[PDB]
Amino acid sequence: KVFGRCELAAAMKRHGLDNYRGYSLGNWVCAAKFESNFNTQATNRNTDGSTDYGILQINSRWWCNDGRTPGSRNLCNIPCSALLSSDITASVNCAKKIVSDGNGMNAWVAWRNRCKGTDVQAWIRGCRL
């Protein structure tokens, strides 16, 4: 499923991401935009054997089990395929653990490269939240 900017913002707000860990909703929408382009089925195979899955591109080496990543942990206790659903619940709950893992939102490279320090409020414009 390809989420609409405000449609996603609303969904994320429902799931408690707005100001979660001090990170405004705009930060989360911006991260999703640059990580997966709002596409829940987004997958990116890395060179180390791991793969990034879904709307927030969660990595299979430590957060979900895809059965093909060497020395992989399943910290979120879910199959990586669950992070590919149109429903964002699994991704949000797992992201909540990732952002609290000692690096804040820096865990998401696209967020750090295209959202960090910018006017993230723009990502929530026109939205009826």
Q: Tell whether residue 50 is a contact of Na ion (CB under 5 A).
A: no
Of 28, 35, 40, nearest to 80 (Cα)?
40
Active site residue 119: no
Radius of gyration, alpha carbons of the chain: 14
Pick the closer one to Na ion by CB: 24 or 74.
74
101 has binding-site annotation: yes
Q: How is 6-64 classified by DSSP, letter by letter? A: HHHHHHHHHTT-TTBTTB-HHHHHHHHHHHHTTBTT-EEE-TTS-EEETTTTEETTTT-
Stretch that binds Na ion, among 7-15, 65-73, 104-112, 119-127 (CB under 5 A): 65-73
d(CA 110, CA 64) in angstroms, rounded, equals 20
Which member of 7, 18, 52, 119 is catalytic? 52
Active site residue 7: no
Q: Which of 65, 82, 94, 124 forms a contact with Na ion (CB under 5 A)? A: 65
Binders of Na ion among residues 6 to 25 (CB under 5 A) are: none
Residue with the shortest CB distance to Na ion: 72
Shortest distance, position 61 Cβ to Na ion, whole Å? 6
Catalytic residues: 35, 52
